[PDB]
Design a protein around this nucleic acid. Structure first.
Ligand code: DGT
Ligand code: CA
Ligand code: CA
Ligand code: CA
Ligand code: CA
Ligand code: CA
Ligand code: CA
Ligand code: CA
Length: 901
DNA sequence: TCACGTAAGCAGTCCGCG
DNA sequence: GCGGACTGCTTAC
């Protein structure tokens, strides 16, 4: 096999590299890498190196990396550009791996670990590490084993050994229900004392040194705690054995509000699963506890125990250890579904970066572009200082708030990357500028044609047409990868709907799920067999189809994220290729494209309907248009359709055969107008929406920009077994909205769109009558909690104190004195409840850490003083009033002449 | 919330609005 | 009471 790196570090004048050799073995080497950098030279001098603008450069080879860094400094002192890759480990990887990397994940040691620390006096601070580490579970991907290190003797209690037999038993047997599939994979090691435990862990770590290190909050808790605890017991040198090169650095992580400290282990790539989840999952959660996320992702029950966690080891050590083991497994289960480790490895090896750099698209793109240019003997420019400047973004149409019965939407494929490719936008393709007219003039095609030579954006920029820029070239590669995975995702989605259909008529038989590849549309033969399957087999196939869809979604949406982040990176001052001319060229072109096609669609439809000035496009945001299809349906007549599917088919055919060709012609004209390099504005039908045939449902409504709901029957070629609510921006979609309220508002919307006013009124009446029975957590609002200290004036709210911060200050006074009570963490999320006038907390609201039950010291009083009326008005009635008034209907029955008889 | 971008909605504070 | 200036937080794209 071809070799591939695992980790790379610069330490002084050496590169330290862990890699897999040509025989599949893990090796380590120290290399005295001599980097090269570049300077401009006279034209009359013979060279093969040129900068991206075509100016000749001389290569300077340095005795060592420090000499290269000091040369960069002197060049600044002189006032001359120092060209080339200044991150020497990226240059090393580029030199050492000058081919497309084919990696074997089975040779990469991926470690997933979790620790337990008993602490009576509050949260055990990693920087202090003053309490014993009393449990470690460490899963190794190569061994496929859970290594359990269990402390039996502590100043906080002496305990008996954990029993794997009781661990395996049902909770109804007094057991812990550790999943049977991992029982045989547990390697249990009890310890007489903490020093023994930690020494053995370090020996273990040395034998099985993680390459990728993950877990849940490992970077903020587990790693710095273990490091600092070993440091406290044994000294720094022993703690540094956590690094395969015995080098660590305290790293200060700074944000807008403050700073925290992590430990950097040289020679290890830490990918904390919480951070992977936050970047790559496209969720915003009310809580990021492992229990909360595990329930959301896997539908597993909350890990139940009695009393505080600080007393769990002493009261029930058996459960204590089992739950530590289960916590490690939960992360593995989440990754088996979401596949973020696979994604990170794919992206990291593609770009030739340290794997942990996948969090940074700026770093990722710097490496991709550097490697690409190096292939042509081209030389990258020096990164420069830039002041942060605002620049314009997308266009969003102001909709007329209303119900909209029949709606068909259309959307541009991968817009910003398609603009980059169409226009040929890149640092080195800038050809000059032209005199700009108002955007309106380009939109309406009355402005003078910008150029007869170059490819243009309506921000005034011109680009070369003779050759693709490096940015278009490299963005195209990742776009094409994304396209493949999106195809797999959509096929799995369509396949899932087939199974859902068949589930309406399951067979009474014993059988097995079919062995199929869900990434490809089911054949006729598979379809025939599916129709003969039991509900058990069908449900298993559905689960598998949905897992395939999720895997496809991870792969496609995050490649979309990477390419969109290149468009954004052009507007970030730390990007080597930062250029507001280019960032704005993209966004302004987008504004034109959307409003151009709005005009074209309105013109086309006014023509076919024989009208004038009628607004068929009701809304658009960035790259999408929403078209009123009422007049199209009315042209054949609702009574002419056999069922809902019949008019959906009709609108599908109309979009495909009439509208898409009209849209295409309109965009080809725009391409010619801007003289672009390549026509890539591909706008396809997205959603077909409307009420069920024969119903009183309203189909859809808009309340304003970025706030709408549609009853969708078909989305991007997926014909749903049951209609799907597409709700954007409304309170149902916000993590700040109480869980039970999201649910109730969603049902109000469902009834509005599918059933009509009377159904809505019936439901509202019931919710208002019963909502006081709902669990307090389900009706609590949620908010991030920043700058608590800023608004804290002697325990009370200062001027302009936000409502949720007021709640936290209330909480802090009510728990004051208690070291044991859960503390609200700065920057984390809280639940928030309003309190009735005259309550013992002395304020109008209270907040506590999200994902948790409020402490038993104040729970009874919170429940008693909860202001249900205010809660209902703010979270439910106010938003529903917004929905219904927009839709022109009433959530409460109006008085009529029929009342009373 | 260390880690690409802008547009834009709503909650809530403060205070005006005769 | 609403709304404007503002902070804060959260979505859509
Ligand atoms: N910089 C940046 N721009 C974004 C992001 N999300 C959306 N945009 C901009 C660029 C997109 O091309 C454009 C339209 O977004 P869409 O959600 O419709 O996705 P896009 O067209 O890229 O992909 P698609 O092929 O429709 O699935 O909006 C983002 O996360 N970062
Ligand atoms: Ca724990
Ligand atoms: Ca799009
Ligand atoms: Ca599409
Ligand atoms: Ca059947
Ligand atoms: Ca879109
Ligand atoms: Ca098309
Ligand atoms: Ca203070």
């Amino acid at each position: 096999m071809k070799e591939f790196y695992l980790t790379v570090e610069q330490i002084g004048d050496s590169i330290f590299e862990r890699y897999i050799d040509s025989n599949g073995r893990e090796r380590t080497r120290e290399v005295e890498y001599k980097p090269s950098l570049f300077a401009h030279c006279p034209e009359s001098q013979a060279t093969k190196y040129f900068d991206i603008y075509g100016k000749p450069c001389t290569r300077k080879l340095f005795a060592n990396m420090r000499d290269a860094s000091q040369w960069i400094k002197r060049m600044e002192d002189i006032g001359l550009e120092a060209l080339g890759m200044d991150d020497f480990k990226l240059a090393y990887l580029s030199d050492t791996y000058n081919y497309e990397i084919k990696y074997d994940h089975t040779k990469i040691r991926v470690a997933n670990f979790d620790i337990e620390v008993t602490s009576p006096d509050g949260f055990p601070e990693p920087s202090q590490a003053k309490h014993p580490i009393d449990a470690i579970t460490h899963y190794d991907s190569i061994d496929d084993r859970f290594y359990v290190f269990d402390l039996l003797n502590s100043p906080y209690g002496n305990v008996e050994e954990w029993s794997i037999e009781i661990a395996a038993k049902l909770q109804e047997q007094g057991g812990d229900e550790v999943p049977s599939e991992i029982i045989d994979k547990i390697i249990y090691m009890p310890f007489d004392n903490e020093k023994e435990l930690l020494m053995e862990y370090l020996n273990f770590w040395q034998q099985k040194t993680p390459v990728i290190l993950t877990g849940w909050n490992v970077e903020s808790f587990a790693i710095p705690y273990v490091y600092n605890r070993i440091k406290n017991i044994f000294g720094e040198s022993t703690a540094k054995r956590l690094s395969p090169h015995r080098k660590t650095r305290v790293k200060v992580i700074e944000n807008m509000y403050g700073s925290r400290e992590i430990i950097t282990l040289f020679g290890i790539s830490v990918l904390d699963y919480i951070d992977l989840y936050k970047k790559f999952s496209f969720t915003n959660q009310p809580s990021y506890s492992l229990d909360y996320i595990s329930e959301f992702e896997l539908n597993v029950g909350k890990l139940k125990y009695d009393g505080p966690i600080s007393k769990l080891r002493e009261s029930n050590h058996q459960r204590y250890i089992s739950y530590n083991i289960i916590a490690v497994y939960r992360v593995l289960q989440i990754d088996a579904k979401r596949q973020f480790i696979n994604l990170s490895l794919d992206m990291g090896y593609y770009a030739k970066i340290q794997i942990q750099s996948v969090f940074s698209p700026i770093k990722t793109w710097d490496a991709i572009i550097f490697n690409s240019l190096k292939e042509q003997n081209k030389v990258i420019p020096q990164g420069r200082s830039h002041p942060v400047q605002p620049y314009p973004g997308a266009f969003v149409k102001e909709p007329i708030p209303n119900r909209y019965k029949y709606v068909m939407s259309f959307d541009l494929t991968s817009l910003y990357p398609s603009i980059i490719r169409q226009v040929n936008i890149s640092p080195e393709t800038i050809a000059g500028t032209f005199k700009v007219a108002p955007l309106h003039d380009y939109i309406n095609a009355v402005a003078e044609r910008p150029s007869d030579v170059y490819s243009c954006s309506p921000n005034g920029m011109m680009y070369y047409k003779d050759r693709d820029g490096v940015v278009p070239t490299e963005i195209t590669k990742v776009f094409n990868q994304r396209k493949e995975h999106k195809g797999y995702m959509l096929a799995a989605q369509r396949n899932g709907e087939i199974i859902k259909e068949a589930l309406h008529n399951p067979n009474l038989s014993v059988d097995e799920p079919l062995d199929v590849d869900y990434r490809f549309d089911f054949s006729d033969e598979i379809k025939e067999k599916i129709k003969k399957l039991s509900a058990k087999s069908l449900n298993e196939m559905l689960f598998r189809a949905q897992r395939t869809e999720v895997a496809g979604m991870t792969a496609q949406i995050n490649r979309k994220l990477l390419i969109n982040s290149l468009a954004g990176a052009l507007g970030n001052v730390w990007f080597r290729y930062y250029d507001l001319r280019n960032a704005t060229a993209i966004t302004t072109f987008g504004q034109m494209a959307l409003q151009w096609i709005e005009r074209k669609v309105n013109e086309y439809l006014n023509e076919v309907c024989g009208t004038e000035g009628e607004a068929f496009v009701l809304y658009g945001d960035t790259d999408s248009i929403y078209v009123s299809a009422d007049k199209i349906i009315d042209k054949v007549g609702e009574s002419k359709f056999r069922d809902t599917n019949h008019w959906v088919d009709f609108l599908d055919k109309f979009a495909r055969e009439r509208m898409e060709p009209a849209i295409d012609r309109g965009f080809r004209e725009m391409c010619e107008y801007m003289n672009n390099k390549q026509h890539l504005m591909f706008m396809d039908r997205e959603a077909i929406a409307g009420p069920p045939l024969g119903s009183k449902g309203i189909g859809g409504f808009w309340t304003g920009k970025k706030r709408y709901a549609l009853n969708v029957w078909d989305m991007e070629g997926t014909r749903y077994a049951e209609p799907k609510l597409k709700i954007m921006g409304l309170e149902t979609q916000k993590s700040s909205t109480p869980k039970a309220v999201q649910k109730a508002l969603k049902e109000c919307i469902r009834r509005m769109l599918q059933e009509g006013e009377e159904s809505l009124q019936e439901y509202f009446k019931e919710f208002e009558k019963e909502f006081r029975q709902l669990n307090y957590i389900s009706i609590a609002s949620v908010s991030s909690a920043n700058n608590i200290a800023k608004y804290d004036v002697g325990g009370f709210p200062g001027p302009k104190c936000p409502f949720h911060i007021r709640g936290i200050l209330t909480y802090n006074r009510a728990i004051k004195g208690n070291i044991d009570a859960p503390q609200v963490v700065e920057g984390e999320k809280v639940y928030v409840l309003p309190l009735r006038e005259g309550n013992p907390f002395g304020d109008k609201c209270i907040a506590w850490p999200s994902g948790t039950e409020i402490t038993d010291l104040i729970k009874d009083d919170v429940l008693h003083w909860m202001d249900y009326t205010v809660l209902l008005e703010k979270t439910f009635i106010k938003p529903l009033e917004g929905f219904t008034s927009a839709a022109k209907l009433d959530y409460e029955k109006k008085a009529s002449l029929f009342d009373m008889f």
